[PDB]
Amino acid sequence: ARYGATSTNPAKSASARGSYLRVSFKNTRETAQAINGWELTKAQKYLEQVLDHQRAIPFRRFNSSIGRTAQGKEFGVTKARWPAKSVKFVQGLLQNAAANAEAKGLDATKLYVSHIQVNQAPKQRRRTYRAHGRINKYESSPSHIELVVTEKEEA
Amino acid sequence: SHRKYEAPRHGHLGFLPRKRAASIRARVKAFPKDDRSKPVALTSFLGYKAGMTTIVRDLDRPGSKFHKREVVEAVTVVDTPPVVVVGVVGYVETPRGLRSLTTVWAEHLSDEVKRRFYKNWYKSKKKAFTKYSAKYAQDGAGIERELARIKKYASVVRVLVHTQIRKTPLAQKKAHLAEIQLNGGSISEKVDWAREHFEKTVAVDSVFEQNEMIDAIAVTKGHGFEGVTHRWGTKKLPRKTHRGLRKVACIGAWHPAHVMWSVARAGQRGYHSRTSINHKIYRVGKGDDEANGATSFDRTKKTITPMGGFVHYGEIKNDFIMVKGCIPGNRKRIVTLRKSLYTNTSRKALEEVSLKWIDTASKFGKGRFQTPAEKHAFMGTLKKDL
RNA sequence: AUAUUGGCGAGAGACCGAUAGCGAACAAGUACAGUGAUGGAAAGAUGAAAAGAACUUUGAAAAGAGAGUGAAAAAGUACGUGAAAUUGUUGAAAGGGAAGGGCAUUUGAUCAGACAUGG
RNA sequence: GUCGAAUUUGGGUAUAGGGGCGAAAGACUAAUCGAACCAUCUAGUAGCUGGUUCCUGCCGAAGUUUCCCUCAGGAUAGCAG
RNA sequence: AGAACUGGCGAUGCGGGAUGAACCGAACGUAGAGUUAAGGUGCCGGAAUACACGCUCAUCAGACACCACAAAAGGUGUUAG
RNA sequence: GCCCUGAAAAUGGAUGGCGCUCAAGCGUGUUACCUAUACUCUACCGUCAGGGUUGAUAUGAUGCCCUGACGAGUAGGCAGGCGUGGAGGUCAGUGACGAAGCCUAGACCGUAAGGUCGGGUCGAACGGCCUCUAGUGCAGAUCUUGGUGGUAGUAGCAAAUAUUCAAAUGAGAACUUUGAAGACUGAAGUGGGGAAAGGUUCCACGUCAACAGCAGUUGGACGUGGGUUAGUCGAUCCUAAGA
RNA sequence: GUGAACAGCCUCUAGUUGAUAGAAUAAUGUAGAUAAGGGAAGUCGGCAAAAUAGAUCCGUAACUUCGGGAUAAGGAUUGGC
RNA sequence: AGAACUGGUACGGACAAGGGGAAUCUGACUGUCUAAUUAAAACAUAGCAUUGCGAUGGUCAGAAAGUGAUGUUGACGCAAU
RNA sequence: CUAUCUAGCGAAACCACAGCCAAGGGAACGGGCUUGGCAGAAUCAGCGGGGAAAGAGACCCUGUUGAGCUUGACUCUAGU
RNA sequence: GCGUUGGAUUGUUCACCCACUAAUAGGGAACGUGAGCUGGGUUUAGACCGUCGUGAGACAGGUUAGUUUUACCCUACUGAU
RNA sequence: UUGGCGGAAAGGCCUUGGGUGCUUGCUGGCGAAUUGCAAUGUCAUUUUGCGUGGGGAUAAAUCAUUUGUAUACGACUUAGA
Ligand SMILES: [Mg+2]
């Protein structure tokens, strides 16, 4: 409970979290925005093709030195990637959402991802051994993910 | 403080930027001066380079040690099947340069050309020039008006022609289309000659002839991202150089505190547009002809195609231009063959040539025979056959 | 009668308030390091009370969504309050080789002081 | 390089800091050697380098004199409050 | 590099000299209105492409104190004597 | 006199720039005009000086009031104030009907240090005035401790010849187990044992949260148990340099 | 097994097949190779690299402490049956 | 050891495996050292020479001693260069 | 074999603020100032011109600061 | 506008001689150019001399051996979207 | 609406014929206030969405796959109903 800013009808909306998740915060971030606002099924069908290297995830912020792909053209972009570990987690949360939305008798076909935000969990710390007797950190940058799916308005 | 010894810089600063050409069909940036006192004819030709071979001929160069002597020369054979007119374009002189005023196309546009306007031809409805063809229905008017527009204004007239690439070994179906300046008399005669050729055909023998010096415009064979050594002919560093020696040592003095536009750097080699001039024509072959590669000296029925086919290209079933020496571009690549911007009254340029022999052994190895006949006559009979 | 930063038993302070006060308010001369002599940390706070979340449901599980407990979960054994750096999301805005500042006003947003005169 | 000897090596044993050990390099003496390591005297002294934490109001300088093992410093007189 | 008297800069913003510790003008509470300084008034740029008499043509003109240099020596260029 | 020659330097460039030729250049003269924190008049802040006034005469005598002049400032001196922990005194001060704290391009007061209020959050204490007191105010010290960034999903994860097919198990298999194939160490071994050293790492079963810089169902990991049998192997006895 | 051989190379018993992985094959690298003609002209300097190399038989200079120098140098031979 | 025959004249066919020569400076030689920038021509050495000492002694040790090294020794020795 | 592009994994150096030039003056070699040239999102592989790039001057001098060493320097001492 | 060289000796800059040549001009760019090389000389510590000094040691005097680190950032430049 | 003319960016210009509104060329009949003595009183044309009614037309590009005239990655050149 207590998500980030949400400007949605809570009764047309079901939601899902995922905390202390060991995925790249940067990478997860990039894929979460990649579906931010999609119709749930479009989202699910696209995140599947990303696992297929059939489509891709546009890298927009955390993205320098990343290679370029023809698959970015779709989104008017040039650097993009196929971050499996993140697609996968984002799917598990997408699937949990759809689940809870069903137990709410929310119509499957009106559902779109109205909110989705990922930010940083506490660092998990490991050592690396550097030349000349030295030691440096070798850290995980884990993730918190939280999305909401919502029933689209009819006019 | 002043370089210790003097040497000339590596490379030509006139040929920058060493980037990859904007297109694979190299632009023609000048045509010959129009003499409006002589018949209308094309000023350049399209064509596909096929390969090279060797010639033997007597030299006609009085005062040379090889005057009245045999010489062997390399030649390249560019495959030039007749082109087809499908449009004219009129240009008007403005104080901002030549401007295309209008363009009129032919009633009927072939599939080869039509394809040039499509990326995905196969899965398209091929609606290319469908509505434009309807302009011909109103007995004249639409088309006629614009022809008249060109006659009235328009300081120079160009024709749109395109290659019949199907008459050519190439896998590519899509045809190459280009503008060509009409250099025969009168702006009016030009557009009329143009109209009287719509959908029809022009061939090289109406453009070029024996011993004619022609220039060659083509994009240069690609080589990808080159180091500084081969890209610029830079001296190699000594074997003891830490972290590499195919570099240049001093990319610059301390001041200007900037690497300068003029020092040698690694990057693209090849795929550069090049207008190479002054290649004398040694043969204007006919396609129907079965003695392409024959001579009034060597009188056997053989086609210009060597035994085994032109390597990485195939056979020469059409007319061809045979030019002395070599030429920008690799095999299969589209080449514009432009005639000269000046009247070279040289001596080299004036020499009329007669070939004595044309090579036709396999270029796919150390070819030992000219014809299937000759190979059989020499080898006798084999375990296979008869 | 005099001395007493040790020992035992006590009574106090215009002392410090968890980076302070003894090194240690905690299984601290501990964990750890060093052949050794020696060196030597960090670390306190759910709630009045575990009432520490039955049960349902999605998941391989961890958990999540409901439900439930409680004065409050905007207290869930990561637990009082929960600042800043830095971060995600939402919303407004600006951006031809930095950004930020000063005087002035346009536009936009926001906020005001008014109070009492016959029906 | 040398490779059957002034050979290489295990364990044991001896030598300990102005001391050891050195086929001699100021070498080696536990990643420490032209004097090891540990704790104490010790918050060693520094005319030298660096920092020195709120606002407003008033007045407002000196790099000159004399003496100094004095010359990157003091005392003295001046300027200042 | 070192003295003399004074004025400055240092410790000081402001107007001018494009720029700039030191030059010129002028020293400073918060403001309004007027007038000026030194310096400017084709356009950048507030302010006469103002008035007046001459001089100057440079295939290396010239254009403002401190100040961002120029000489011995020459010209049948042109002006006045 | 002006003009010309004498007059040669290194990135591309400087009457400040454009550009200017009866000048927008050089010499001289005459008007007009632009503009400083300076000058003139005026309001207000403050500082200094001079003066009036508690005669009964409500709330400031260190007060009210009148008049004139003045205002640069480092190092530095003095003054008047702002804020903090704790102390005596007093408002019979605020407070679970919400203290302190925190957040807030909301509001008001002060030239300022600062003060006051609203809203949100919060949950047990705390403040004004007169005095007392000091371990009393930070941007700097390659300051101390802790926490966090850009760098950056980047450097990189390339020595030691080399892996492949299938099946089983499993939520999940490039990495586990069995099967097959291809190869390696090639007895100076990647084989079989020991000595210093370690101390349970051995074996079984279960098991993957952390750890094995990919992964994991695997492990020298985690959890639970099990295991080391002597008259003859050693120590033990002896003497060695030495102690 | 080859061979002088506990060398190198291949094998048997035994033990491994473990050192992130996939797709490409730009530059520049690190490591391994080769180059027509010339032959140290490169460079402080033949640094690096290249040439020689086992064995049998032949042959072998100055100098010398008579021991050496010396595999001096220089030659020919080498499979299989 | 010899001979005959045979092959794209090849045969230590992989593997394994010295380049040689003429000199100058210098150290005799094998040996040694600056662990982690100097392996040398530096240190050592055999060889040569010099010095001290017959024990109530030479050289050295210790705060002192009924203390100790050489010394289980004696000039063909111990000590010092 | 790398570099490269992908999945997983994931550091460090350094950081006043930053990052286009020419000339000027200027602490006499500016990314910032003045006057000009100019100047268009977001980026990939390379590169060694510049950032007087990065990591309490050992040279030199000054200090009434040392230490290792030498000696008919000053003042001493075990020993003899 | 365009060229301005190949070599013997030296770390050399400079110099000198051979040789070719149209010509073998002179300078700048942090005495251009070391995260570009190289490391021959100067410029630590090893060592050999000569001169000097009683000695420790000293001598732009000779001699020999002596570790050349980082770019993945910004900009510039090369190329690429 | 009849004829022409204009390509430098013609995108406008001349011309024929009538139709229709006005006509201040001239002569009449009405209206205007109280918007209170100025403040606020002509609406210009850009874009973009929607609302109607008429005319009109009925595609490609990209990912994926493929070629190798191309290529570090994007990109480039091919081919696929
Ligand atoms: Mg010296």
DSSP state of A127: E
In strand C, the nucleotides that come within 7 Å of a protein beta carbon are: 57-66, 73-74, 78, 87-90
- Cα B270 from chain centre: 17
User: Is the CB of residue B304 less than 8 Å from the CB of residue B80?
Assistant: no
Which long-range contacts (C-beta less than 8 Å, at least 24 apart) are formed by B339-347? B339/B32, B339/B43, B339/B44, B339/B207, B339/B208, B339/B212, B339/B214, B339/B215, B340/B32, B340/B213, B340/B214, B340/B215, B340/B277, B340/B278, B341/B30, B341/B31, B341/B32, B341/B33, B341/B215, B341/B277, B344/B213, B344/B278, B347/B61
Query: What nucleotide is nearest B241 when CA is compared to C1'?
Result: J37
Q: A94: part of which helix (H) or strand (E)? A: helix A84-102
DSSP state of A148: E
User: Is the CB of residue B37 less than 8 Å from the CB of residue B185?
Assistant: yes
Encoded tokens for A107: 């119509």
CA distance B215 to B278: 5
State the resolution, in angstroms.
3.1
Encoded tokens for A94: 């997408």
User: What does the H/E/C string look like for chain B?
Assistant: CCCCCCCCCCCCHHHCCCCCCCCCCCCCCCCCCCCCCCCCCECEECCEEEEEEEEEEECCCCCCCCCCCEEEEEEEEEECCCEEEEEEEEEECCCCCCEEEEEEECCCCCHHHHHCCCCCCCCCCCCCCHHHHHHHCCCCCHHHHHHHHHHHCCCEEEEEEECCHHHCCCCCCCCCEEEEEECCCCHHHHHHHHHCCCCCEECHHHCCCCCCEEEEEEECCCCCEECHHHHHCCCCCCCCCCCCCCCCCCCCCCCCCCCCCCCCCCEECCCCEEEEEEEEEEEEECCCCCCCCCCCCCCCCCCCCCCCCECCCECCCCCEEEEECCCCCCCCCECEEEECCCCCCCCCCCCCCCCCEECCCCCCCCCCCCCHHHHHHHHCCCCCCC
In strand K, the nucleotides that come within 7 Å of a protein beta carbon are: 7-9, 57-64, 67, 69-81
Whole-number Å distance, alpha carbon B241 to ligand 1 midpoint, is: 33
CA at A140, C1' at C30: how many angstroms apart? 31
Whole-number Å distance, alpha carbon B212 to ligand 1 midpoint, is: 79
User: What are the CA-CA distances from residue B168 to residues A47, B49, B287 (Å)?
Assistant: 46, 11, 11
- Cα B263 from chain centre: 32
The per-residue b/e assignment along B107-138, b for 16 or more CB within 10 angstroms, e otherwise, is eebeebbbbbeeeeeeeeeeebbeeeeebbee
Whole-number Å distance, alpha carbon B1 to ligand 1 midpoint, is: 30
CA distance B285 to B322: 8
Collapsing DSSP to helix, strand or coil, A84 comes out as helix
Query: What nucleotide is nearest B228 when CA is compared to C1'?
Result: G27
The reply to whether B24 has its C-beta less than 7 Å from any atom of strand G is no
CA distance B376 to B122: 46
User: What are the CA-CA distances from residue B155 to residues B101, B103, B152, B289, B300 (Å)?
Assistant: 10, 14, 9, 40, 50
User: What are the CA-CA distances from residue A58 to residues A30, A64, A73, A93, B365 (Å)?
Assistant: 7, 12, 9, 20, 51
Encoded tokens for B172: 């590519």
CA distance B62 to B55: 21
DSSP state of A91: H
User: Is the CB of residue B280 less than 8 Å from the CB of residue B59?
Assistant: no
> Residue B56, Cβ neighbours under 10 Å: how many?
16
Instruction: Write the Ramachandran bin of B154: left for phi over 0, alpha for psi from -120 to 50, otherwise beta.
Output: left
Whole-number Å distance, alpha carbon B244 to ligand 1 midpoint, is: 38
Strand partners, A16: A147
Burial of B155 (0-12, 13-18, 19+ CB in 10 A): middle
The reply to whether A25 has its C-beta less than 7 Å from any atom of strand F is yes
Give the contacts of A145 (CB within 8 A, at least 6 positions apart). Answer: A17, A18, A21, A28, A32, A89, A90, A93, A116, A117, A118
CA at B255, C1' at J75: how many angstroms apart? 15
The reply to whether B265 has its C-beta less than 7 Å from any atom of strand G is no
User: Is the CB of residue B140 less than 8 Å from the CB of residue B63?
Assistant: no
Q: A102: part of which helix (H) or strand (E)? A: helix A84-102
Residue (of B322, B235, B228) closest to B283 by Cα position? B322
- Cα A102 from chain centre: 21
Residue (of B217, B285, B382) closest to B55 by Cα position? B285
The reply to whether A141 has its C-beta less than 7 Å from any atom of strand F is yes
CA at A143, C1' at F42: how many angstroms apart? 70
Collapsing DSSP to helix, strand or coil, A71 comes out as helix
CA distance B63 to B173: 51
The reply to whether A117 has its C-beta less than 7 Å from any atom of strand C is yes
- Cα B272 from chain centre: 14
> Residue B231, Cβ neighbours under 10 Å: how many?
20
The reply to whether A132 has its C-beta less than 7 Å from any atom of strand C is no
Collapsing DSSP to helix, strand or coil, A130 comes out as strand
Instruction: Write the Ramachandran bin of A137: left for phi over 0, alpha for psi from -120 to 50, otherwise beta.
Output: beta
User: Is the CB of residue B323 less than 8 Å from the CB of residue B78?
Assistant: yes
Encoded tokens for B142: 């639409």
- Cα B210 from chain centre: 17
Encoded tokens for A62: 């955390």
Angle, to 10 degrees, between the axis of helix B187-195 and the axis of helix B142-152? 150
R_g of chain A computed on alpha carbons: 18
DSSP state of A60: -
Tally the C-alpha atoms within 13 A of residue B130's C-alpha that lie toward its C-beta.
4
Sole residue written with tokens 């375990």: B383
CA distance B153 to B155: 7
Sole residue written with tokens 């920058």: B16
Give the contacts of B36 (CB within 8 A, at least 6 positions apart). Answer: B184, B185, B186
DSSP state of A154: P
R_g of chain B computed on alpha carbons: 25
CA at A130, C1' at H39: how many angstroms apart? 34
Collapsing DSSP to helix, strand or coil, A2 comes out as coil
Measured in residues, chain B has a length of 386
CA at A98, C1' at D23: how many angstroms apart? 87
Query: What nucleotide is nearest B237 when CA is compared to C1'?
Result: J37
Q: DSSP letters along A9-59, please?
A: -TTSEEEEEEEEE-S-HHHHHHHHHTTTT-BHHHHHHHHHHHTTTSS-EEP
Chain A 85-124 contacts with nucleic strand F (CB below 7 A): 120, 123-124
CA distance A119 to B9: 57
Whole-number Å distance, alpha carbon B68 to ligand 1 midpoint, is: 80
In strand I, the nucleotides that come within 7 Å of a protein beta carbon are: 4-12, 21-22, 29, 31, 42-51
The reply to whether B244 has its C-beta less than 7 Å from any atom of strand G is yes
Whole-number Å distance, alpha carbon B136 to ligand 1 midpoint, is: 101
Sole residue written with tokens 């040592």: B249
CA distance A20 to B153: 76
Whole-number Å distance, alpha carbon B278 to ligand 1 midpoint, is: 71
Side chain identity at A86, as an amino acid letter? S
CA at B230, C1' at I14: how many angstroms apart? 37
User: Is the CB of residue A30 less than 8 Å from the CB of residue A47?
Assistant: no
Sole residue written with tokens 């008006």: B145
DSSP state of A104: T
Residue (of B46, B38, B30) closest to B181 by Cα position? B30
Give the contacts of B341 (CB within 8 A, at least 6 positions apart). Answer: B30, B31, B32, B33, B215, B277
The reply to whether A18 has its C-beta less than 7 Å from any atom of strand C is yes
The reply to whether A54 has its C-beta less than 7 Å from any atom of strand C is no
Measured in residues, chain A has a length of 155
The per-residue b/e assignment along B258-270, b for 16 or more CB within 10 angstroms, e otherwise, is eeeeeebebebbb
- Cα B190 from chain centre: 24
